[PDB]
Amino acid sequence: NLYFQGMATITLERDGLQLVGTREEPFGEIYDMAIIFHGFTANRNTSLLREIANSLRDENIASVRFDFNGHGDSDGKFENMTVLNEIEDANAILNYVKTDPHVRNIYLVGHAQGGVVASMLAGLYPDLIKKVVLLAPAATLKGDALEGNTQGVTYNPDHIPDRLPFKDLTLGGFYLRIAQQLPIYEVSAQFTKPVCLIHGTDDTVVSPNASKKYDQIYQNSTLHLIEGADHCFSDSYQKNAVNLTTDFLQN
Amino acid sequence: NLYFQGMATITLERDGLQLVGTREEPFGEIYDMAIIFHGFTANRNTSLLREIANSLRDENIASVRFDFNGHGDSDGKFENMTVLNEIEDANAILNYVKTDPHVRNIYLVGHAQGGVVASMLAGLYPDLIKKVVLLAPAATLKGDALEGNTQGVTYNPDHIPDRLPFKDLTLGGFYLRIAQQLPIYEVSAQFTKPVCLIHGTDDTVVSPNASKKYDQIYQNSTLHLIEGADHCFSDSYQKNAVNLTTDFLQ
Ligand SMILES: O=C(O)/C=C/c1ccc(O)c(O)c1
Ligand SMILES: O=C(O)/C=C/c1ccc(O)c(O)c1
Ligand SMILES: [Cl-]
Ligand SMILES: [Cl-]
Ligand SMILES: [Cl-]
Ligand SMILES: [Cl-]
Ligand SMILES: [Cl-]
Ligand SMILES: [Cl-]
Ligand SMILES: [Cl-]
Ligand SMILES: [Cl-]
Ligand SMILES: [Cl-]
Ligand SMILES: [Cl-]
Ligand SMILES: [Cl-]
Ligand SMILES: [Cl-]
Ligand SMILES: [Cl-]
Ligand SMILES: [Cl-]
Ligand SMILES: [Cl-]
Ligand SMILES: [Cl-]
């Protein structure tokens, strides 16, 4: 604001769980603010998200970025996380943001599963959210769950087990049952304001077809396919992802 | 079980919320179990729900009935409840029931908004749930939120407030935003096993069309329109709804 600028650690509560986040506070009495959502098994302080936050703050756009339940410093077991309760975390964070008296426009920015959170939350709040940036939004998680193959880990999609050993973690059965019937595009499509879609052509984790589909369903969207980029927009690709995001939002 | 019969309080956690419930425990080493779900602003111990649980227990069908988040004895503010986090409560109850070694078949019984929770939970667990009874299930909560009128409380459906005073309570705006796009019939239709639909013809809170619609969508449903019954199946209609429910579950 006019008096304080910089970082602070913030904590919110959703259904008895603490959510830990980082706020970047820019100059000025009034400013826009982005809520930035990390992906599946990630956290709020990946290099991509730290750099999005930094780049937006460089343009006087505030941001908050939280660890979802079951991730980073936030409460709850990973086994108990679903995309639905991450949407609930997102709405709790939105509650905090929309009552801040300095905030003018609210933007959502999401990477991967965090992009599914953002897109569905924007379709639930199409009157309140002003712009959305989706980075490699993992809408394919639904089809993957219907097919019985999530990130190479297989199971009967009609007899989902109670819990699924999942690389080094344990993925909840309820995560997969929710994922199969999540109305991702049905809800997301109700957001008719501007959307920026950014997806690496060499993403082997979420097919770039997810972004080509969101681009079809959205009334006012712009698709940026990034030649050769990977799922995480890492290294030599990170700046372009951060640049497109910031430009879209600074307009 | 073979040694204890009767009522007990049970508590479960869902996220960081405690849910408080009542278990009705019948005779016998193995038995079927109904999970019973109350409606909007109700609690686990309404007359109707108590009578259903007792009637099942007399037929050696166990049951549990919990207060949803933001209701009765359970944790959380009412303002923060939605049908979505009720399905999350119902799933935490299902986790408890499905790991009990005495339980044979699992049934869901839901009244009004508890009926939408039951029908959606059964469409998420169509492999596990064996039968579902819905009493006046409130699927019309969706159309009502799209219309901008929830039990006579009004708002612009395209400009839903942050919160809405509602009788002596505070309803959350997110409840309403959820309601408008809730895929009630899409998810519910995945359950292809037997469903009993019980709806009173003089229900003024939830149109009987709600249960006629479920009857169309379900592969295997039986529809009971009880002539003269109101939303709560009050007075003489209560035993009629209870006996249909018990008979169907067996
Ligand atoms: O957030 C990510 O980085 C990846 C998410 C993702 C991608 C594919 C799936 O099947 C799934 O459950 C989650
Ligand atoms: O549970 C009940 O007894 C009634 C539920 C109900 C009925 C109509 C609505 O619009 C609504 O949000 C909830
Ligand atoms: Cl100021
Ligand atoms: Cl990193
Ligand atoms: Cl988050
Ligand atoms: Cl897929
Ligand atoms: Cl990749
Ligand atoms: Cl749209
Ligand atoms: Cl488009
Ligand atoms: Cl007793
Ligand atoms: Cl026993
Ligand atoms: Cl009562
Ligand atoms: Cl709410
Ligand atoms: Cl709200
Ligand atoms: Cl809210
Ligand atoms: Cl469907
Ligand atoms: Cl009535
Ligand atoms: Cl039918």
Q: How far is CA A64 from CA A12, A113, A178, A239, A250, in A?
A: 12, 17, 27, 20, 16
Across the interface, which of B16, B80, B91 has its CB nearest the CB of A75?
A: B16
Length reported for chain A: 251
Residues B91/B117, Cβ–Cβ less than 8 Å: no
**8 Å CB contact of A177 and B125:** yes
CATH superfamily of B1-250: Alpha/Beta hydrolase fold, catalytic domain (3.40.50.1820)
Residue A137, SS3? coil
Helix, strand or coil, per DSSP, at residue B127:
coil
Instruction: List residues, by chain if needed, whose CB lies under 5 Å from ion ligand 3.
Output: A 1-2, 29
Q: Tell me which residue has tokens 């060499």.
A: A202
CATH code of the domain occupying A1-251: 3.40.50.1820
Query: What is the structure's resolution, reported in angstroms to one decimal?
Result: 1.8
Q: Using DSSP, state whether A120 is helix, strand or coil.
A: helix
Q: Are A80 and B15 within 8 A, CB to CB?
A: yes
Chain A residues with a Cβ under 8 Å from any Cβ in chain B: 14-17, 69, 75-76, 80, 84-85, 88, 91, 95, 98-99, 123-125, 127, 158-159, 162, 174, 177-178, 181, 183, 186-187, 190
Burial of B71 (0-12, 13-18, 19+ CB in 10 A): buried
Cα–Cα dist A73/A21, whole Å: 8
Write the CB contacts of A13 (distance below 8 Å, at least 6 apart in sequence).
A19, A92
Ligand 1 atom, smallest distance to A144 CA: 10
B93-132 burial, b at 16+ Cβ within 10 Å, e below that, comes to bbebbeeeeeeeebbbbbbbbbbbbbbbbbbbbbebbebb
Helix, strand, or coil (residue B133): strand
Evaluate: CB of A140 within 6 angstroms of ligand 1: yes
What method did the depositors use to determine the structure?
Answer: X-ray
Three-class secondary structure of residue B112 per DSSP: coil
Burial of A165 (0-12, 13-18, 19+ CB in 10 A): exposed
Angle at B22 between CA B16 and CA B24, to 5 degrees: 140
Residue B189 C-alpha, separation from nearest chain A C-alpha, in angstroms: 12
Helices (H), chain B: 47-58, 83-98, 113-124, 141-147, 173-181, 184-188, 209-217, 237-249
* Chain centroid, CA B170 distance in Å: 21
Residue B59, both tokens = 């037929």
For residue B195, how many other CB atoms are within 10 A of its CB?
Answer: 27
Beta pairing class for B149-150 and B153-154: antiparallel
Which amino acid is located at A163 in the chain?
R
